[PDB]
Amino acid sequence: NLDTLYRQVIMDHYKNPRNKGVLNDSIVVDMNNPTCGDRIRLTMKLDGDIVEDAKFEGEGCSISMASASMMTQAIKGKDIETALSMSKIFSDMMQGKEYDDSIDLGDIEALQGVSKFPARIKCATLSWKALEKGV
Amino acid sequence: NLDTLYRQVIMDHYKNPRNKGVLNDSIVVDMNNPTCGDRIRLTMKLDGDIVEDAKFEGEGCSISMASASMMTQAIKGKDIETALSMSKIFSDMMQGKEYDDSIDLGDIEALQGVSKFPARIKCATLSWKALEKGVAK
Amino acid sequence: HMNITDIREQFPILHQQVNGHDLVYLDSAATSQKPRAVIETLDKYYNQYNSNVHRGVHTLGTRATDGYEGAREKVRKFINAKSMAEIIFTKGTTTSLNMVALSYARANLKPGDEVVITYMEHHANIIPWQQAVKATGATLKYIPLQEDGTISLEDVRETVTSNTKIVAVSHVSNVLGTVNPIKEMAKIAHDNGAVIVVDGAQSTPHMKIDVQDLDCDFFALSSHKMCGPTGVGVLYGKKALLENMEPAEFGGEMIDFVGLYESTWKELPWKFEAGTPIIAGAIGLGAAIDFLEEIGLDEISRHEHKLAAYALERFRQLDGVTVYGPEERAGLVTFNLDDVHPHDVATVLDAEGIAVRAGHHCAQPLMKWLDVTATARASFYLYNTEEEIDKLVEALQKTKEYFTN
Amino acid sequence: MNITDIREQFPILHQQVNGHDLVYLDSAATSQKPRAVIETLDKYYNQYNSNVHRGVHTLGTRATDGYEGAREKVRKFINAKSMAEIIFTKGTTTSLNMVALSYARANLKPGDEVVITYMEHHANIIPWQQAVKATGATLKYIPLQEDGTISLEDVRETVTSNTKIVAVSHVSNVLGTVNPIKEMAKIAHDNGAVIVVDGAQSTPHMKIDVQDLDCDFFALSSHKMCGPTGVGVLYGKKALLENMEPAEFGGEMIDFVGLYESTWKELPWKFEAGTPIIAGAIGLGAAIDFLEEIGLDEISRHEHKLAAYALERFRQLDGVTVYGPEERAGLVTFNLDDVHPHDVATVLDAEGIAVRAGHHCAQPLMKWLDVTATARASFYLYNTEEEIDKLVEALQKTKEYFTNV
Ligand SMILES: Cc1ncc(COP(=O)(O)O)c(CN[C@@H](C)C(=O)O)c1O
Ligand SMILES: Cc1ncc(COP(=O)(O)O)c(CN[C@@H](C)C(=O)O)c1O
Numbered sequence A: 001n002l003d004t005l006y007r008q009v010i011m012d013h014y015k016n017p018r019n020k021g022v023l024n025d026s027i028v029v030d031m032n033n034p035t036c037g038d039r040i041r042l043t044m045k046l047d048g049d050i051v052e053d054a055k056f057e058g059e060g061c062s063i064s065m066a067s068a069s070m071m072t073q074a075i076k077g078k079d080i081e082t083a084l085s086m087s088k089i090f091s092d093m094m095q096g097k098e099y100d101d102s103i104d105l106g107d108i109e110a111l112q113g114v115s116k117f118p119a120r121i122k123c124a125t126l127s128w129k130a131l132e133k134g135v
Numbered sequence B: 001n002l003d004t005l006y007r008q009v010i011m012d013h014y015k016n017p018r019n020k021g022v023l024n025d026s027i028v029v030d031m032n033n034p035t036c037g038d039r040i041r042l043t044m045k046l047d048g049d050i051v052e053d054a055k056f057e058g059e060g061c062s063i064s065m066a067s068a069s070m071m072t073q074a075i076k077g078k079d080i081e082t083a084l085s086m087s088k089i090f091s092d093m094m095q096g097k098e099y100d101d102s103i104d105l106g107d108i109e110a111l112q113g114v115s116k117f118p119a120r121i122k123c124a125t126l127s128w129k130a131l132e133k134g135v136a137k
Numbered sequence C: 001h002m003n004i005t006d007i008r009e010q011f012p013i014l015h016q017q018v019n020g021h022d023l024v025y026l027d028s029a030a031t032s033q034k035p036r037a038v039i040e041t042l043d044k045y046y047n048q049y050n051s052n053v054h055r056g057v058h059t060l061g062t063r064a065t066d067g068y069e070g071a072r073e074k075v076r077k078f079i080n081a082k083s084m085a086e087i088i089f090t091k092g093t094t095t096s097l098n099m100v101a102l103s104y105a106r107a108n109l110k111p112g113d114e115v116v117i118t119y120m121e122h123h124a125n126i127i128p129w130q131q132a133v134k135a136t137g138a139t140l141k142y143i144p145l146q147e148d149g150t151i152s153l154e155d156v157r158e159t160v161t162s163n164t165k166i167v168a169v170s171h172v173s174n175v176l177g178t179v180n181p182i183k184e185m186a187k188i189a190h191d192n193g194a195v196i197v198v199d200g201a202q203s204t205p206h207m208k209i210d211v212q213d214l215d216c217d218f219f220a221l222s223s224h225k226m227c228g229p230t231g232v233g234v235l236y237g238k239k240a241l242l243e244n245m246e247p248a249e250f251g252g253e254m255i256d257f258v259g260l261y262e263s264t265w266k267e268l269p270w271k272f273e274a275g276t277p278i279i280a281g282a283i284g285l286g287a288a289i290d291f292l293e294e295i296g297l298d299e300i301s302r303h304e305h306k307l308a309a310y311a312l313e314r315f316r317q318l319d320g321v322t323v324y325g326p327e328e329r330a331g332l333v334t335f336n337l338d339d340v341h342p343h344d345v346a347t348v349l350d351a352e353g354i355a356v357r358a359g360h361h362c363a364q365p366l367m368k369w370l371d372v373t374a375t376a377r378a379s380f381y382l383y384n385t386e387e388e389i390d391k392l393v394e395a396l397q398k399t400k401e402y403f404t405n
Numbered sequence D: 001m002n003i004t005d006i007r008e009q010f011p012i013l014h015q016q017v018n019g020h021d022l023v024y025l026d027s028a029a030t031s032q033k034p035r036a037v038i039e040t041l042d043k044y045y046n047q048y049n050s051n052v053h054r055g056v057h058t059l060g061t062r063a064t065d066g067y068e069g070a071r072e073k074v075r076k077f078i079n080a081k082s083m084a085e086i087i088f089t090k091g092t093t094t095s096l097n098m099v100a101l102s103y104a105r106a107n108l109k110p111g112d113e114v115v116i117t118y119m120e121h122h123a124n125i126i127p128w129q130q131a132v133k134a135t136g137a138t139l140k141y142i143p144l145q146e147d148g149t150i151s152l153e154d155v156r157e158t159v160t161s162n163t164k165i166v167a168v169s170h171v172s173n174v175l176g177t178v179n180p181i182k183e184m185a186k187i188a189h190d191n192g193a194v195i196v197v198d199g200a201q202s203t204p205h206m207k208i209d210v211q212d213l214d215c216d217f218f219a220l221s222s223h224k225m226c227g228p229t230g231v232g233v234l235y236g237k238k239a240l241l242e243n244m245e246p247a248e249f250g251g252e253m254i255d256f257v258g259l260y261e262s263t264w265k266e267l268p269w270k271f272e273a274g275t276p277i278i279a280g281a282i283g284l285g286a287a288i289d290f291l292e293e294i295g296l297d298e299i300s301r302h303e304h305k306l307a308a309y310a311l312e313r314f315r316q317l318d319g320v321t322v323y324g325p326e327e328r329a330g331l332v333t334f335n336l337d338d339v340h341p342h343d344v345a346t347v348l349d350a351e352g353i354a355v356r357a358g359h360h361c362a363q364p365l366m367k368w369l370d371v372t373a374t375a376r377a378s379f380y381l382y383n384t385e386e387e388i389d390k391l392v393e394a395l396q397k398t399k400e401y402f403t404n405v
């Protein structure tokens, strides 16, 4: 049913987001989902070629905020190229595509379900687009 | 055939028009047919509420020029806004409906035929359309 | 009067399934669906007599031209405009309002002049004026709103001054459902030496429009919201004002004489219709007008008021739902569930086959005025039933229970 | 795919006009539509009509996927680099007016020149007339050779370092000439100018590659390429569209809307204000699929063959002047001696044949030809050599009829 979209891990990241805040000497971009109900401000401090820490502030639907939490936590210590590869994998994931399961997504995999709810793709995609404009 | 509603008298007015020329010290309206290609420069010099002389120069199809010619000759010396009444009668005539027949309504009438070939209504109405803008304050 | 079963039978799009549920379409405020009458009008046009219009000499050309101009006459009668000269076919309400802002506003604003709008306005009735004032050095002013989301005539009298040249206001709010006092506002505008521009996108499909009684100077409407084709709308303006406005676009059809460097414009209304017009769309809008007229706009209004009252009463028996706007309203309800973001509400409703809109419904300043980031909105039209209201309310309750157990 | 199959796909062809088989030779005014396109519109209005973009329900998703997929189809059809450079408009006229409003008026001072041709359609004349008039710039005309072609030497003489814009039709709707658009783009760029191409008449009949043409702007109309009425395309180089202000303001084209300021959406939606032409754009995509399956190269080869056949048959009829050069598109503009083209068109239509008579929205060209009006038969993918034979036989009946008087 609806339970194949609002999976337990998603609802947990919605209730208890992980990297909540806007932090210091950093690259900070903000985003808004076209249907203005999802707002994100992404904060990333980059260590030469890797992302040492990422945090976010926002207000929006369950899917957008949970995706922001899961993404920010799945990018800690990963490289820029690994991060963009994750983003491309996620974009394929929200369409029909096969995708390369090499590279762990962790909890992010749970958003597979909103492939069957295309009206929320940008909901889940907002966060990641913040990253692609970050670089 | 059916194209013999290209009336014999109409071909006279296209052949040898009536009021071809200019009219100075008067009211000058200029019009082009929506269906591009028919040009009229209708000039009327009037004696108060009547048109003492009406002339036109233009270039266009048989129907437009013939309607202008017949118009200028049936409208030489016309009376009051009865001219507008003639215009409404002509417009009804081209929509097929019958009119308040014989308020002189000199000549023309053969344009009754282009109640068929509606693509030419505008051709015949050009001249009369000029008149209606001529009087428009 | 309205037999809803017969009405619905004519709308093929209604009789389908979405996620194993009967479609419950409650998004007519975003766009309306089309009866067989209209779709078949388009079919017959493209199947039998498609040809270019006006400049034309052959049979099919005459048929297409008679169709287009007959649709213009139908619109004129539909909104009770004095003359066909005052009916201009446009792309939509947005294009109509932009034409007013381009051709009228920029030629009649100097510094010190004011454009007076509303907090509730659709973006279409906000941004053009923003640009116009900024190009002319004029000033934009907002009529404030009452707690219940209505406008008081007194606030209008306070806001509009002798410096006001233009007052622009939506006839019906697409968010609040408010029916604005357009007649009295037109009088206030005229008493202060101003013209009134009415965004009538949301009223035209649901209410009879009489521009002579309203005495509005401009009126904008969209076909796609009144059972008509996409891509066509209407701009109405008082003939005397259109006479002295420059065209908004330049090209074929709208000209009289063309020199190498200068040109004269056609008489109204063709002055404002550049290029090959929206032929099929205009003819289909005429068909939609015939359909709605045969049903009766007053009967459509009665039906929507009954459904609006029924929906409001059923909504107040739902706890933890805020409804925005006043009691007396058009056929729409904008609301929010506590602790359920409208995106999630829309996903659950669509999972039960129900179609509603979520977001700022193109009224960002109004969202700020309500101190909210987004809302959900169910809208009603002639084909909607009380049963669909029941399905909507039960689905909202399932949404509440689902997100909070 | 044979000619008979192609005609079999166009329902409008198979009917009688004045007891004769329809002979439609007015595709240069507008094209007819194949079953594919009409059924695309049917399926849209029957199954998945809803508003596009910001919406959250299933039907909305289907309609949005359809609209944006049509945009992708257009982009591939004309070989534009990016979707960001494909803007859906009302038509070629609106596209050219957008260029004149947003680009021309922001980049002309006194001293600047806009350079056009004597052959230009009114759509590609009047906007520039207005732009130069608002900016204090100067309009200049590239002369034509006696045969009605353009010389590259004439353009190099006309275009100077002061030229900011060169606007030219890809194919003349009167002369049938195919202008050297690529070399003209080269000359425009060498003199510090951009080139705007009116491609209303080329797009339906020949492959368009905007990258090879290197044109800065390109305008086209759907109704001329087997597509629905009311929709067209503006293409512009991405870098230029980035720095042009929107032509209209409203919903859909914004990012944020405050009371006094608003930010614009990214391309291409920056230039698409309000509810877009949904069904029309989807149907234009269907028409592009249809034309691609046939092949634009086959359509061009077929039209040349019929143009050559028509010319050869034409001048072996005495007393007809054809205007323009030997190599041409699928159209012939002509005149019979002492018979005004309106009378010719009425006789031809009495034999079921549809042609256009008068100006063809190119008044200065008429002045250049020292004629008040012309007749024009145009060809498209569904026309035959037999219909050319019927046209010549009808022209002969026209002459003999107007000699019996
Ligand atoms: C009150 C109101 N005003 C103006 C417009 C602009 O009309 P077009 O988009 O048809 O040009 C709309 C369209 N409605 C959509 C955008 C909505 O708000 O649901 C509207 O509902
Ligand atoms: C060369 C040319 N340019 C521009 C246009 C304007 O297109 P729209 O009106 O669809 O925007 C046309 C239309 N054709 C008609 C007028 C003809 O050739 O007779 C044209 O032939």
Ligand SMILES: [Zn+2]
Binding pocket: A033, A037, A038, A060, A061, A062, A063, A064, A123, C343
């Ligand atoms: Zn969301």
Ligand SMILES: [Zn+2]
Binding pocket: B033, B037, B038, B060, B061, B062, B063, B064, B123, D342
């Ligand atoms: Zn004529």
